[PDB]
């Protein structure tokens, strides 16, 4: 009975850590993608300068 609760508790803890890791990995990945949006709008400065 107690072994069943323990094993169930260990599974839940394992997966809840995997979710926490993926949540942070994803949030980090989207910020890095957003940073790639800024960095390239800034590369149009070179284009708009060429147009000036």
């Amino acid at each position: 009975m107690g072994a069943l609760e323990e094993l169930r508790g260990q599974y839940i803890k394992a997966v809840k850590k995997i979710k926490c890791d993926m949540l942070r990995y994803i949030q980090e990945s989207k910020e890095r993608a957003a940073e790639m949006v800024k960095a390239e709008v800034l590369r149009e400065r070179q284009e708009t300068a060429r147009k000036m």
């Binding site: 260990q10 599974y11 803890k13 394992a14 850590k17 890791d21």
Partner: peptide, 21 residues
């Protein structure tokens, strides 16, 4: 790195559960 962290949570589960058993 995220791969390591997943292997860790698994290995910890294997050690905790083996001891319970």
């Amino acid at each position: 790195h995220i791969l390591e962290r997943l292997d860790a949570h698994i290995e910890e589960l294997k050690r905790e559960s083996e001891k319970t058993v």
